[model samples]
Target: SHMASEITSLDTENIDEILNNADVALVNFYADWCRFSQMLHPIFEEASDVIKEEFPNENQVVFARVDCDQHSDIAQRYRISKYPTLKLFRNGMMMKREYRGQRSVKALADYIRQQKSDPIQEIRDLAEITTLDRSKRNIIGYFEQKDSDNYRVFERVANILHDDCAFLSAFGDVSKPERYSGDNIIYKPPGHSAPDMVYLGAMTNFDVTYNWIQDKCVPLVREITFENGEELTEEGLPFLILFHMKEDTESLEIFQNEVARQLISEKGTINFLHADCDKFRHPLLHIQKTPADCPVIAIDSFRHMYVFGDFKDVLIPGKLKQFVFDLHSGKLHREFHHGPDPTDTAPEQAQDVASSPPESSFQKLAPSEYRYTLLRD
Candidate 1:
C-alpha cells in the first residue's frame, strides 16, 4: 500500500495493530491548532509519500500521524517530554533516537535514511529477546507516541539470534505493562503494569519453556535496569559487574586487561560489562578493587545484571567460560556450560548451585557493620 489510508486523527483502537505490525512506525505528535506544525503539514504529507515509494516493496517501515489534540492520554503515556515530537516504533518498542530536529521532507528523509541502520545499545524497558529452541517466537512491543526517529535501533537486526533459539514473544502497548520489579522480577501479568511481569496464560507445563533457564520465563517477568538505562541486573548466567576503586586502579585494570583478554581470546561474548564504583560511589568500599570482597556478579531467573556482594567461594567462571566458548565455537549441547560435570570440583551433583548461589556468599554480612532503624510514630 502506498500509504496507510490517513485518519482525521488517531484513536487507541487502531493504534495497537499499527504500532505492532508496521515494520517501522513514525507517530508524529502535534496539536492540530499548533501554528508551528500547521505550516509543516504539507512537508509531513510529502515525507509520507516519499517513504511509501522508497520502501513499498520491503514492507519494513510504516508512517502515521498522531494528533495531540485527540490523544492526550496517549501523549501522556509516551511522556512526550517535548513538542512536535517524533516517536519511532520498531519490533514494537518506543524510544527516542538520534535526530537533530530536522523538519521538511528532504531534511527528514535524510535523517530517516541515516536511521536506516540502528545503533548497538541496550534498553531498560523492552520486550527483550531470550533465544531458545522450540516453536516460533511472537513479539508485541508498544509505545504511546508513534514516530520513526524514536525507533531506529531494530531496523537492521530483526530479533536476537541464539543458534537454536525457539520462540520469542515481544509486544509493546501505548500503555505500560501490568507490573515490574527491579528487572530480576517476580511478576504476575494481566494484573500489573510499570513493572515487567509474566504469567501462565498459555504454554502450561511446557518443558521447552521451562528447561532453559534463559528461556523459561514461566513467570514471564524481567525487571528494569539499575539506572533506567540499558544496564540490567542480577539475573541469568552469573553476570560479572567488576567494580573497582577507580578505572585506573591497578586491580581494576589488571582484572579488565587481563581478564578481558583471556575471556575474549578463550571464550568471547560471555555476558559481561565492566565499571568503576570509585567515580560512582561516594566513598569506595573496602577491599580496594577485588571481587573477593566487592562481590559484584548477579544472575536472575530471566536475564542478567551487574551487582556486588561478598564472594566467599562461589565461582561461575568455569561455567561462564564454557558457555562463552560454546558461543564463540557455535556449540549447542548440555556440556557447553555444564552445570555439574562428571568430574565437577564439588563432585556431588546434589549441590550444583543451580537455582541459587552457594550459601557461603549468603552468610550473615558481618551483622552489617552498621544497622539501625528509623520509625515514625
Candidate 2:
C-alpha cells in the first residue's frame, strides 16, 4: 500500500493523536480565503515532502495543516489570528516562538533541521562562559553528570525556550564548584553584574522549574528593539516606555521596581517597556528631546504620545500608577484637546495647559496592510 501525501489534513478529531505521536510537528494554521495562505500551500507541501524523504520515519516528524474556517475550535485553541502561521511542536508541547523565517521550501526545511537538533551549547571551560553574548539573556545549567534525570529536564526546557534565551551547559568536573553540592541552574540577564540569579527549586521539578525559567527568560519589562517593534505593536497594547542611557542602571531599576509594585494589575492592559536612549534617539526627538534628556518616561497610546513628568516624581507612591490610570480613563486625551481640568487647584495644572501633548510617533510601528490582510468584514 502507498502512503498518502506528506501533508496530513488535521481537524479537532485527529489533532491530538497526530501531534502526540510525532516527535516533531510543524502545523500550518491557514484560512482558505487568505491570499498569503494560498501562496504558501504549494511551498508547504513541497517542504513536507522533502523532510519526509530525508527522515523516512513516519513517526519521527509530521507535517500537518488545518483549515481555520472549518476547524475554528482548533484555531481558537492555538490563538490563530493571522493566516499562514506556522507553529512548531516538540513532543506534543507547543513552543513559545512561532516560525517567522522566510517562507520558502529551503527556509522551512532548514528551520526544522535547526529545531530538531540539540539546542544546548556546551561550555568546555568555565572561562568561556564569560565570553558568551551579553546582548541576549542566557540560562546556564551545571550538572554533575549529563546522563542524569535532572539534566534531562533541563534539556527539555532548552528545547522549548531556545528561541527566547540562549541555553548553555557545563557537565562533570568542568562545572565542579557550581554543582559540587548538586545540580543547579542560573539566569544571566543582558549586560549585568557578576552575581547571576540562581534557581532555588529542585531541578527535577519540571513544572516549577519551567515556570521559574520562563519568568526570568521572558521579562515583564521587555526591551524593545527595532526588529521586534512590529511584533510588539501587533499586541495592541499601549506602551509605557522608559528611555534611559545605556550606562544608567539606576533609572532602569527604579522604573522596573515601580512597575512591579504599582502596575501588577495592568499587565494585560499595557506593555511595560524600556528603550536604550542611544539607539532609540528618533523616538526621543519625536517628543522634542535629545539624548541629554535621558531617563525620560512616556506613554504611546497608539493615537498620541503623552510625556510623563520628571523621573523623581515617579518615585512618589501611586504617581506612576495614576498616570496610566488617567490614560485609560481618557483624561490624557481629553486634556490634550480641552486642556487640564478647570476644577483643579494645583499651580502646575496651569503650566500643562500652555504646551500641547506630543502626537503619536510609535503608531507607525503597528502592522500595515501590505504585510497583513485585514480579516475583518
Candidate 3:
C-alpha cells in the first residue's frame, strides 16, 4: 500500500520550489479533526497516483497536501481558513472551483483526466457547438479532413489561443456544407446572439493565419470602456493598454497590425488592450495630461502603472519587441522602481482591487472561515 508515493507533504520551505517547477499542481489544505477531510484524504491520494502514472513527465503535474493545523503560516499566507480545501494551478494561473462531484475514486480520477486533456476541444457538428458554453467566445475551424495540412494549421492556431478563447475543429460534415470549402475558421464573440465571423483565406502559413486570427477572430487589443473595465481586470494578467484618439485610426492600425500581430504568443502572459480618449476621458487623464499625449502606451500591473517613455519609440525597428522583452526580463520592473515612488499611495480604490497575489496563481476565495459541506453517509 504505497499510496504515499503519489502525494507529497509540503510546508513553507518547499512549497514555492515545488509549485514553481510544475506545469500544473493541485494542493489540498486540511486539518485532522475535520471528518470531511478524513473522508477526502484517501481519495486525493488515489487521484494523485493516477495523475502521476498518466502524466509522469517532469513538471507535468504534481499533487501535494498541507496540514493547516501544523503549518499555519503557509495556510495563512494563502488565506486558507477551511479544512479539506483544494486548489488547482495551471502554468502559474489558478482558479477556485467548487468540487461538487461524487467523492468516489472513479469520480476523482475522471475529474483529473478531463483536466489533463488539451484546452482545445473537438466538435463533430453544429449541434455539438450548441452544447458548448455560449457565454464565452468560440473559435472553430471547419476543415476538409483531420489529416489534411489545413487541419494541422488549425491545431497550431488552437494551441496558441486555447487559453484566451474556445477552439474547436470539425470537417465539412460539421458545419454548413456551403460555408465549408473544407478550410475555414469561424469566431463568435462573447454573446449568444453575436454573429459568427468566418475566415476564408489560406491557413498554410502560421504567421499569416495567426495574423488573420488577430485581426478578425480575436481582438488583439480589447477596448477598455466603463462597461467592460471590470471584465478586463478579471482577465487576471496585467494589461498593456493603448490610449489614443479615434481619429488616429492610422496609429491604431499600426499598433494592431505591427505590434499586436507579432506578439500573439504573449496573450496568456499579458493582456493587450486599448481605450478611446474621447470615451474614457477621465481615465485617459491618469495616463497622460494633454491631448498631445494621445498615443500613449502604458501597463497596469495592478501594483503599479508603468508608461512607455516615448510613443514614437515604438515604431522603430525591434523597439516594441525590446520593450516587451525588457518587461519580461525584469529590467523594466527594476527601472520602474528607480524613480520617485508614486505607487505606495496609488488611488485607494485601485489599491483595494481583489487582485491575485504576485507570487502564485492561488488567491483567497473568501474572507470568512470555512464551513463543512458534509459528504457523510
Candidate 4:
C-alpha cells in the first residue's frame, strides 16, 4: 500500500481528486450492470501492461475509471450511457472522443501511452504498422460470397484487428442490408454475397488472417427482452452485457443491491436488467457456455463465456462489490468465473438438467402445477 499515492480512484467517491490530479487520464465510462465491461477488463489489463512495457518513459498516462451509474453528473456531462465507453483527458481538457465497442485493451493503453507525444496527432495515426523488417502495414483479402467457404481468411482478419482497424469487409455491406433487431443493419457477410476483408490498422501490428474452429461464432436465434421487451443486440456494445433473471425482478432491486453496486463502484462495467427469458429466447441461441451456470452472463470481450446457470454466484453483495473494479484491473481473471454454480450442483445427476430436459429444472413442476401433471399435456 506504500504506492497508494501513485494509484487514485476516479468516481463519485473521489472524482474531485481525479479531475485535479490527472492531466492525461484515460477513463473508461461504464456501469456495473453491463456484462460486456466485465469481459473487456482482462483485455484492458493486458493493454495496460503493454503501456507499462513500451511507454516506460511517459508518465502522463494515468488510467482511471468512472461509474456512469454512480456519477450521474459526470455521465451526463460526458453524455455517456453506453458500456465500455472511454474518454481521454489531456492537460485538464476533456476530449469528446467516444471509444465505444473497441474491446482491445492494447488499443486503449496505446492511446494513453502515446499521450506524451504530439497532442495534435490523431489517435488513428498512432497505430503501429511495423512488421517483418519493414512496414507491412495492411492486409487485404476478398470475400466474394458471405456464405462462401473461401471467405475464411476474411473472417480471420476481423477477429485479428478487431481492436484497432475496423475489420469487417469494409464499412459494412450496404448492398444487402438485413434487419437485425429493430435496426436496419448489415449482418456479417456485408453484401450478403461478397466476403471482403480490409485491415484497418498498420500491417504487422494487426491482420485479419483466416482461422477456423478456434473461436465461438454465437448465432442469436432468440430475441429476449427487458420488461418493455427490447431486443439486445449481439455484444450489446452501446448497451453492454446481457442481464437475464430467472425470477421476477420488477426493477433492478436485487440486481442493484447485489451485483450492480460493486460492478459500478469498482469495475466500471455497464449492466442492464432483463427478465422473462420466455420472451427473449430467440437471440439467446448458441449462448450457453456459462462457467458455473446461473441465469446468464454474456461477456462480449475475450473469453466470451456466457455464464449460464446460477447468476446468484455473481448476484451476491460482497462479490458484486468487487466485480467491476477487480475485473477492470485484471486482478480477478482466474478468480472470476460466471454462470454454473460449482457449489450449487444438484444431487449427482451426472448430467445437466437443462440439457437433459425431462429431468431438468424446467421439467420439475411446482406444487401448484403438480396437480396438472406433465402427461396430460
Query: How many residue pairs clash per model?
Result: 50, 0, 0, 41
lDDT of each: 0.41, 0.84, 0.66, 0.40
Sort order, lDDT high to low: 2, 3, 1, 4
Model 2 steric clash pairs: none
**For candidate 4, which ten residues in a row score worst on lDDT?**
356-365
- The most accurate candidate by lDDT is 2
Q: TM-score for each prediction? A: 0.33, 0.84, 0.40, 0.29
Off by over 4 Å in 3: 1-6, 122-136, 140-165, 169-187, 190-377
Report the lDDT tens digits of candidate 1 across residue range 1-377. 02233532457887777787766677777665655456556777788778777777544767766765578778777765334566777645674341324467998777566455433323234434323211222222232222432222222222222111222222234123622321121222221222343433322223322333234322111212233122222121323444543323344333444344445644322335444454423212322244334424332212222223333212435444444444334342333234434663555344333343222221121111122111111
Colliding residue pairs in candidate 3? none
**Model 1 score (lDDT):** 0.41
Residue 95 shift from truth in candidate 1, angstroms = 2.6
lDDT of model number 4 = 0.40
For each candidate in turn, give its C-alpha RMSD to the true structure in angstroms: 20.5, 4.1, 13.5, 20.7
Model 2 Cα lDDT, one tens digit per residue, 3-103: 23458889878999988888889999887777878778889989998888887786877899988888999988987768878888878888766676677
**lDDT digits (tens) for residues 1-377 of candidate 4:** 01121234466657656665655566766556556655665676566566657655444566666666667887787655456566666444565333433368756765564444432111121122111111111232323344543344344334333332233232123322321221111222211233423223222222222222112122111223331121133222212234444453322344444543454443324334443454445334435433223255443332332232345656544654444444445543333333223465442323333331111121111111222111112
Model 2: CA > 4 A from native = 1-6, 53-60, 129-136, 189-197, 200-202, 245-247, 277-292, 338-363, 375-377
